Write a protein that binds this DNA or RNA. Structure first.
Ligand SMILES: [Mg+2]
Ligand SMILES: [Mg+2]
Ligand SMILES: [Mg+2]
Ligand SMILES: [Mg+2]
Ligand SMILES: [Mg+2]
Ligand SMILES: [Mg+2]
Ligand SMILES: [Mg+2]
Ligand SMILES: [Mg+2]
Ligand SMILES: [Mg+2]
Ligand SMILES: [Mg+2]
Ligand SMILES: [Mg+2]
Ligand SMILES: [Mg+2]
Ligand SMILES: [Mg+2]
Ligand SMILES: [Mg+2]
Ligand SMILES: [Mg+2]
Ligand SMILES: [Mg+2]
Ligand SMILES: [Mg+2]
Ligand SMILES: [Mg+2]
Ligand SMILES: [Mg+2]
Ligand SMILES: [Mg+2]
Ligand SMILES: [Mg+2]
Ligand SMILES: [Mg+2]
Ligand SMILES: [Mg+2]
Ligand SMILES: [Mg+2]
Ligand SMILES: [Mg+2]
Lengths: 68, 141, 59, 145, 70, 46, 64, 187, 75
RNA sequence: AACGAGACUCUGGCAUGCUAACUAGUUACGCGACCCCCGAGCGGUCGGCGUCCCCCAACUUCUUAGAGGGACAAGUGGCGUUCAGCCACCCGAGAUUGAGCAAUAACAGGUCUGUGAUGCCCUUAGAUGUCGGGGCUGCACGCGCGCUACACUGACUGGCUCAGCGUGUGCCUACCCUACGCCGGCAGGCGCGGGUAACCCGUUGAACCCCAUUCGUGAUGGGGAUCGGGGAUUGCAAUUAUUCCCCAUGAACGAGGAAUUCCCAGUAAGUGCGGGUCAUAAGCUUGCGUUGAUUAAGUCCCUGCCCUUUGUACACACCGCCCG
């Protein structure tokens, strides 16, 4: 199966959130474009994975705060 | 009716009788001692095979112009069983296909094409359409 | 173009192979113009190892 | 229909009238399928009959066409002994002349002691096949003393 | 001879469903779309199965030649 | 034949054969006794 | 030695038993009084909800 | 009928699966009624996708076996076709009910596993009951018409008939009875 | 193998029995008629085509690999 | 913190959205023409068939190939220390295509017969550096990879109707792919053209499969070994038959002992087609399509692999060591 993200994806998503916290929402097709415009991801698959982990983190930051 | 609107296996059967009902379409002399292709083992069962193959060649020329001997011999080519070794594809017999096309020209049914090859005449399209209509009206298709 | 060779000299080992291949791309352009202007425009800005062939009558 | 005598004794060989003619006369040597079909077509007799349905005025015609083929327009490229090595004839050798011709050909070869005769004498393979791993008629050899 | 029967049978359905959605009403096409897609898919949606490539060391994509110790 | 000029007296029966078809290039073999590698039943030495 | 047949419905899949992992432990009720339950070893591809037929229902499965 | 496909001729309503276990694993009627036992059929994709397959296409698939029959399915549809007509003549009952009864009469419900010649008895899942029934019914027709003058279509109908009319004269019912006897010994 | 000595053509006894079986058989195929009598099986085809011509049996299916008849579409 | 995994590259699946095409097409009618009434009708007008001919017609659906798009466990329900994640489902072209590349450390693995890579030793004019002839193919026997079969879910004879990946005129080196006419039963021959190729062979009329005949459980019309006689082609030369064609002869074999190999979906198996070697030539291998199942969704029993704890008289490492 898989679907376990790698440290290169998780660290990128954590930095993207920790800097542009107020531009990111709850839908995936907008976070994709935001991360596309604020960073430089040298692939499209990596862009989708980073933007998909950003959404899963945002859905949690609306609850109690995460520890990273 | 058109030729494409009727079952072709009955069309060939009717056209074979049409051809072997006139007395024309002079057959070769070696009709009883010929194997019909390299990849065969016996002579054709049907004694009057030349009229069936003439009808088949004519209905094939109705469907594609400019056919010529080198394609009739590909249209009748099949599989050859090389005894103990694997099988392969094989051509028909140039002599048979050439004599069939020459015997059809002897009926004003076909003519040599403008580009090299053979083609139906206007008089041949009519003879095929009449037999198509006859077959269609017979079986009430 | 494809060439599939054995990977080893000498014929020993597991029987692996290598698959090399070259790819040739081709395009054509058609113009209706005097030949002088054609030689004017076709002989400028040819950077890579692309071919450029000019034929005087094809239509 | 017409349970009449079926077992035929054609020249030096037994035919069973229980089979179709084109496959019954192949029981004779020198007569295969491709030959028998032509011999039956030239003789104008039917081809859906069992071999017992032939009265004594058909079998005779069939065999006299089977033995003198070039008379009845059977071609040359179709006969089993062409340009006969010692007489220049064209013929189908049929029933017992077949074994005699074969033995005469083997003896001719062995006489001048050509190579084919020497392979026929030693009971080996006459064409160019490998004999290291095929044929294999004898018994197993023991390696432990 | 058999991959073309399915092509024809899918194409004429894909045609009648497209003609009903451009020159007729919308419900008049979504009725026949459901009538077709309930009895059987592959009447409107093609299937992506394709042949797989042969690899060296076997007569096909997955089979291997016979191993032989001793 | 590769080492030796074996002699032949030409007879009117050999007309149209090859002269090479009358002196063989090898000895017709008579077998010995099978040696150490001849079967899987045989391997061992000290 | 004389017992009728008993149909039993599967309500839980426990695990794969046997040397090759070739059969499955399954808990069943008895189609007549749901207050009964036993554990059996089934040979085929059993889902949850299927109905098994028992030629001998007074037995119970230990393992293997 | 304009909305009810039969088989061309064989109506698929009024056919009763008289088992409570084997239904939901025999797809005869009311949603799996189709004109021919031939679909694209990506049924070997997930675990239980196989039970949704029509039963006549589960027999057509299994009948083409032993080497020089693989992929020859248009030859294996005409076999089932010619056999259903033979069945309708010899008996008179709807040929699908004979097939259902034959599938029921020939799937074993007890069987035995080699364990630790030690065997231990176990009970058969319904899907495996259907699979074993189909395999046994096809092997009987295969072995019956291997060197006979009878055809593969006469012997398939013979098998189906002797199985639906439980008689022990069919290969499938002899085999079922052996597996259940051998399993009863190892109980 | 075995020895199946079938008859290549009929005799009068078998020939009358072949017409006295017509109302009896629900399924008629060449193989069944081969197994009932001792018939060469390629004679059974001709016998059934002859019986069909005389309206004595009814054709329910004909195919290259199979032919099926039944008794007069009755019972 | 670094390498390997992953990311990455090629490939298969989707776009009626973009870009744009007589070396690709569609539709339209300009058409024109053939043919049949097959329909109303008359046969005409309307239609029906066309790889029959045209368009400086309109377009890109099918073909081509570029740019972008699109899938992320994103949505919903369960299970999760509510974390990492797992199962199911809606929507969808798709919710798990297939390959390429690949680490530290090592093996007395293979290659001196790929090399104008190479150390040392040997030979060097009676040569271990060139022409003619023979061998590498010889046959009591043991073994490995494979081809064809053991027939009726078949063989034979006719009829019908569908592909994809490729290659194609050679410099030294002299040979390429073929259309179409004629001649010959056949292999093959003669004569005239096209193609350095989306242009010609070619709309690649492939085989299995499909539809009808004959056979009838008999080593039979299953099988095609072995052998006789004749005819062609390549080549400087065919005998120890190079390859091909024709008539004839018609062996074992009726599903295979103990053992043992490969395989999860467009996959196994059946089936044919190209490339490689190739003056001549595939039962080999390397790719391509075509028909298309049964069985699994597991386990550690057998054979092995990875990580932890433990024991050791081993370290040439259990194929070890070692006692009388
Ligand atoms: Mg394959
Ligand atoms: Mg660290
Ligand atoms: Mg969730
Ligand atoms: Mg859906
Ligand atoms: Mg992958
Ligand atoms: Mg490595
Ligand atoms: Mg080296
Ligand atoms: Mg050296
Ligand atoms: Mg070498
Ligand atoms: Mg030299
Ligand atoms: Mg030399
Ligand atoms: Mg060698
Ligand atoms: Mg090998
Ligand atoms: Mg055929
Ligand atoms: Mg085969
Ligand atoms: Mg090949
Ligand atoms: Mg070539
Ligand atoms: Mg080749
Ligand atoms: Mg090789
Ligand atoms: Mg193994
Ligand atoms: Mg591990
Ligand atoms: Mg330790
Ligand atoms: Mg030590
Ligand atoms: Mg030890
Ligand atoms: Mg000692």
């Amino acid at each position: 199966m898989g679907r376990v993200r790698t440290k290169t994806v998780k660290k990128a998503a954590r930095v993207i959130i920790e800097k542009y916290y107020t531009r990111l929402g709850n839908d995936f097709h907008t976070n994709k474009r935001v991360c596309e415009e604020i960073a430089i991801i040298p692939s499209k698959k990596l862009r989708n994975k980073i933007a998909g982990y950003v959404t899963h983190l945002m859905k949690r930051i609306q609850r109690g705060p995460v520890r990273g | 009716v058109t030729v494409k609107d009727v079952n072709q296996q009955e069309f060939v059967r009717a056209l074979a009788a049409f051809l072997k009902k006139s007395g024309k379409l002079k057959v070769p002399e070696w009709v009883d001692t010929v194997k019909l292709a390299k990849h065969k083992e016996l002579a054709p069962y049907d004694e009057n095979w030349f009229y069936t193959r003439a009808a088949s060649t004519a209905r094939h020329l109705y469907l594609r112009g400019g056919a010529g001997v080198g394609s009739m011999t590909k249209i009748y080519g099949g599989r050859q069983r090389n005894g103990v070794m694997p099988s392969h594809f094989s051509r028909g017999s140039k002599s048979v296909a050439r004599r069939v096309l020459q015997a059809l020209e002897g009926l004003k049914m076909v003519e040599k094409d403008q580009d090299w090859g053979r083609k139906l005449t206007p008089q041949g399209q009519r003879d095929l359409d009449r037999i198509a209509g006859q077959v269609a009206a017979a079986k009430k298709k | 173009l494809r060439i599939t060779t054995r990977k080893t000299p000498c014929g020993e080992g597991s029987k692996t192979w290598d698959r090399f291949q070259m790819r040739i791309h081709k395009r054509l352009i058609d113009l209706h113009s005097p030949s002088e202007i054609v030689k004017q425009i076709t002989s400028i800005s040819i950077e890579p190892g692309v071919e450029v062939e000019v034929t005087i009558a094809d239509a | 229909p017409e349970k009449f005598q079926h077992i035929l004794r054609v020249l030096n060989t037994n035919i069973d009238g229980r089979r179709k003619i084109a496959f019954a006369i192949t029981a004779i040597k020198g007569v295969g399928r491709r030959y028998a079909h032509v011999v039956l077509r030239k003789a104008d007799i039917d081809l859906t009959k069992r071999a017992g349905e032939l009265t004594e005025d058909e079998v005779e015609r069939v065999i006299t066409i089977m033995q003198n083929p070039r008379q009845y327009k059977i071609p040359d490229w179709f006969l089993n002994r062409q340009k006969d090595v010692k007489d220049g004839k064209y013929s189908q050798v049929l029933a017992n002349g077949l074994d005699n011709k074969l033995r005469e050909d083997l003896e001719r070869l062995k006489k001048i002691r050509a190579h084919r005769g020497l392979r026929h004498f030693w009971g080996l393979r006459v064409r160019g096949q490998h004999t290291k791993t095929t044929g294999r008629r004898g018994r197993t050899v023991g390696v432990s003393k | 001879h058999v991959a073309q029967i399915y092509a024809i049978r899918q194409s004429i359905s894909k045609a009648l469903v497209a003609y009903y959605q451009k020159y007729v009403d919308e419900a008049s096409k979504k009725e026949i779309k459901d009538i077709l897609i309930q009895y059987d898919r592959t009447l409107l949606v093609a299937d992506p199965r394709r042949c797989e490539s042969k690899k060296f060391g076997g007569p096909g994509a997955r089979a291997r030649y016979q191993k032989s110790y001793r | 034949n590769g080492k030796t000029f074996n002699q032949v007296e030409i007879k009117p029966e050999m007309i149209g054969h090859y002269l090479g078809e009358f002196s063989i290039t090898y000895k017709p073999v008579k077998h010995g006794r099978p040696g150490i590698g001849a079967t899987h039943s045989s391997r061992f030495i000290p | 030695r004389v017992q009728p047949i008993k149909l039993a419905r599967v309500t839980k899949v426990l695990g794969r038993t046997g040397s090759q992992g070739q059969c499955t432990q399954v808990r069943v009720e008895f189609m007549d009084d749901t207050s009964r339950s036993i554990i059996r070893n089934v040979k085929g591809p059993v889902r949850e909800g299927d109905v098994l037929t028992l030629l001998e229902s007074e037995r119970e499965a230990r393992r293997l | 009928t304009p909305d009810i496909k039969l088989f061309g001729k064989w109506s698929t309503d009024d056919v009763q699966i008289n088992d409570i276990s084997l239904q939901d694993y025999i797809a005869v009627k009311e949603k799996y009624a189709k004109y021919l036992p031939h679909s694209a059929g990506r049924y070997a994709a997930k675990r239980f996708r196989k039970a949704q397959c029509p039963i006549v296409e589960r027999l057509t698939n299994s009948m083409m076996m032993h080497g020089r029959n693989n992929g020859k399915k248009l030859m294996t549809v005409r076999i089932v076709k010619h056999a259903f007509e033979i069945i309708h003549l010899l008996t008179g009952e709807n040929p699908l009910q004979v097939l259902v009864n034959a599938i029921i009469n020939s799937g074993p419900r007890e069987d035995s596993t080699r364990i630790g010649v030690r065997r231990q008895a176990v009970d058969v899942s319904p899907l495996r009951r259907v699979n074993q029934a189909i395999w046994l019914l096809c092997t009987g027709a295969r072995e019956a018409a291997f060197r006979n003058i009878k055809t593969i279509a006469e012997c398939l109908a013979d098998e189906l008939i002797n199985a639906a009319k439980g008689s022990s004269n069919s290969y499938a019912i002899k085999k079922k009875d052996e597996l259940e006897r051998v399993a009863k010994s190892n109980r | 193998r075995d020895k199946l000595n079938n008859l290549v053509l009929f005799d009068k006894a078998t020939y009358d029995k072949l017409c006295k079986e017509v109302p009896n058989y629900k399924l008629i195929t060449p193989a069944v008629v081969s197994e009932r009598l001792k018939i060469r099986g390629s004679l059974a085809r001709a016998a059934l085509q002859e019986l069909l011509s005389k309206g004595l049996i009814k054709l329910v299916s004909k195919h290259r690999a199979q032919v099926i008849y039944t008794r007069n579409t009755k019972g």
